[PDB]
Amino acid sequence: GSLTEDGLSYKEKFVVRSYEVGSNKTATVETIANLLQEVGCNHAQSVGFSATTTTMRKLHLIWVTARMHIEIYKYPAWGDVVEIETWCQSEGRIGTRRDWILKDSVTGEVTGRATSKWVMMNQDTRRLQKVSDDVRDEYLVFCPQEPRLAFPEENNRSLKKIPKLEDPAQYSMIGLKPRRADLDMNQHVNNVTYIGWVLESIPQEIVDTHELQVITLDYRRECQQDDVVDSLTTTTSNDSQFLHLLRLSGDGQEINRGTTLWRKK
Amino acid sequence: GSLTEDGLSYKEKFVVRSYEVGSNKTATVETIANLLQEVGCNHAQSVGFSATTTTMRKLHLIWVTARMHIEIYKYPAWGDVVEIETWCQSEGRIGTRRDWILKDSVTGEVTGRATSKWVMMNQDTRRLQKVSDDVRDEYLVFCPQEPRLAFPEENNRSLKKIPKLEDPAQYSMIGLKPRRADLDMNQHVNNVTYIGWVLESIPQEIVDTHELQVITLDYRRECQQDDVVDSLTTTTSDSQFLHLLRLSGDGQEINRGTTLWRKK
Ligand SMILES: CC(=O)Nc1cnccc1C
Numbered sequence: 001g002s003l004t005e006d007g008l009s010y011k012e013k014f015v016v017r018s019y020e021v022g023s024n025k026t027a028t029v030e031t032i033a034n035l036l037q038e039v040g041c042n043h044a045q046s047v048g049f050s051a052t053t054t055t056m057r058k059l060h061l062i063w064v065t066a067r068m069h070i071e072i073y074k075y076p077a078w079g080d081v082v083e084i085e086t087w088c089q090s091e092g093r094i095g096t097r098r099d100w101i102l103k104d105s106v107t108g109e110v111t112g113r114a115t116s117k118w119v120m121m122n123q124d125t126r127r128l129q130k131v132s133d134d135v136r137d138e139y140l141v142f143c144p145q146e147p148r149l150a151f152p153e154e155n156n157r158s159l160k161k162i163p164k165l166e167d168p169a170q171y172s173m174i175g176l177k178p179r180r181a182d183l184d185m186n187q188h189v190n191n192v193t194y195i196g197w198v199l200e201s202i203p204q205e206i207v208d209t210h211e212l213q214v215i216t217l218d219y220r221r222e223c224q225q226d227d228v229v230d231s232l233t234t235t236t237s238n239d240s241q242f243l244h245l246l247r248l249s250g251d252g253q254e255i256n257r258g259t260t261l262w263r264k265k
Numbered sequence: 266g267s268l269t270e271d272g273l274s275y276k277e278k279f280v281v282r283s284y285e286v287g288s289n290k291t292a293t294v295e296t297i298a299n300l301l302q303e304v305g306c307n308h309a310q311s312v313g314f315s316a317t318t319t320t321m322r323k324l325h326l327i328w329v330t331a332r333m334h335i336e337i338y339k340y341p342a343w344g345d346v347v348e349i350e351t352w353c354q355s356e357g358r359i360g361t362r363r364d365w366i367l368k369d370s371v372t373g374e375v376t377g378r379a380t381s382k383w384v385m386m387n388q389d390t391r392r393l394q395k396v397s398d399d400v401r402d403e404y405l406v407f408c409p410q411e412p413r414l415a416f417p418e419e420n421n422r423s424l425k426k427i428p429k430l431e432d433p434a435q436y437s438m439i440g441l442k443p444r445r446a447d448l449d450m451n452q453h454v455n456n457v458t459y460i461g462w463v464l465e466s467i468p469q470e471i472v473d474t475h476e477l478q479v480i481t482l483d484y485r486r487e488c489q490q491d492d493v494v495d496s497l498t499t500t501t502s503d504s505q506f507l508h509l510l511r512l513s514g515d516g517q518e519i520n521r522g523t524t525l526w527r528k529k
């Protein structure tokens with residue numbers, strides 16, 4: 001991978017692996033989400049970040065994902081080369097945004113796009129806080145100055161408000177627990193595992209006859225290594241739309257909410 | 266990746282990814298096992314398989330893993346390039362064997378090695394089969410003729426008999442279930458998931474202070490998508506452990522294994 005000529009974005013190619021594909025012999029949405037996270041990490045390393053700045057490490061501050069929105073037009077087949085371009089942008093004191101564009105390396109066509117919202121949080125107390133000017137000036141030299149949006153449209157799905165699923169859920173998958181492969185290098189549950197847990201409550205017949213087109217996921221609280229999760233889904237709708245909720249098995253504390261859109265194969 | 270000059274083995278380079286590493290910032294044994302499986306699939310593709318031959322597809326026959334044995338000296342760090350070489354060999358009527366050698370791309374030093382035993386099985390009835398001459402001849406042209414062993418040493422750990430863990434287990438992790446990310450393209454549980462499930466019953470303090478050096482795993486039966494597994498571990502000793510994966514209900518054995526860990 002490499003930063004582009006202007007040094008304001010990063011590109012990387014990936015060859016789709018045998019264990020990364022589903023029943024259709026094409027990359028799963030979890031493989032796509034892992035590759036977005038990997039290109040994001042390589043962009044941060046290429047410009048000197050950990051994505052903590054110098055001020056952040058002094059004040060015990062970290063960037064955490066608040067929302068992930070992904071739209072896939074074509075999932076790359078096993079053995080195909082996908083090219084991913086990523087860039088960041090400041091959203092004032094609210095936080096930052098990371099965007100991605102996925103392309104077929106052979107045709108050059110856009111096969112997917114993603115956008116994510118990140119907020120500043122104290123690592124220890126878990127208290128969210130606005131972006132200070134001292135931090136903002138350390139990362140603005142690595143962002144495009146004019147707005148560059150993966151989802152530019154006026155009323156796009158990436159900024160829609162997601163409601164809370166009401167009991168009883170139409171479908172559910174109970175007692176989900178993370179294993180060591182679900183944890184990152186800091187022993188925290190990987191953001192992609194939550195995408196998998198959400199999808200677990202979609203019936204197998206929908207997965208067998210439909211393709212996932214859009215997924216929007218809000219991250220409210222994290223799941224600890226010794227926590228247990230319940231995944232809940234209710235149909236809200238040719239296309240099939242679902243409302244999703246991940247909550248802790250015991251007290252029912254919300255960890256995530258989301259929506260998925262599926263199109264008939 | 267590519268077949269070597271003689272066309273009897275296959276090499277491929279991998280850059281270690283951010284999500285592939287554990288708390289030590291080096292590749293997990295599950296990442297290593299996924300890469301071995303990936304280089305194995307690329308070797309099969311390069312010579313025209315898929316690893317079913319022409320007569321295997323007609324007879325509804327498949328290769329299934331009976332045993333996996335892996336030894337790691339150094340786990341590659343995040344961002345490091347690892348080179349993996351793989352080859353196959355006939356073991357007469359018993360089945361076939363796939364071997365691997367892992368190297369650091371910069372130094373050229375051997376950082377790990379693996380060996381696996383595969384048996385012929387009817388995909389529908391699940392009945393084990395002897396290979397037979399017609400199938401044997403269809404793949405022997407892709408194997409080295411003289412023996413080439415990743416674990417040559419007489420009396421090596423790769424061929425040791427593994428006993429059945431007796432109740433009560435010292436440690437356990439119960440109610441393990443596969444999710445869709447644990448399934449392969451044929452909707453079967455990926456062989457690497459069983460390695461993860463075995464490791465789940467090792468206490469976190471052993472993982473925090475030791476490094477896994479050797480893992481031997483026997484595959485007795487498949488875990489289905491709607492099955493639930495219990496992972497059991499007992500210390501037998503370096504730290505050595507005896508392992509058992511069994512179905513949560515009836516207690517039917519799915520796997521047994523051993524691990525060896527060295528103090529960091
Ligand atoms: C805060 C932020 O978005 N940081 C970042 C990380 N990696 C590459 C570029 C940037 C601007």
Ligand SMILES: CC(=O)Nc1cnccc1C
Binds near residue numbers: 309316362
């Ligand atoms: C049965 C067997 O070992 N097959 C194989 C698959 N891929 C590459 C080479 C070979 C010989």
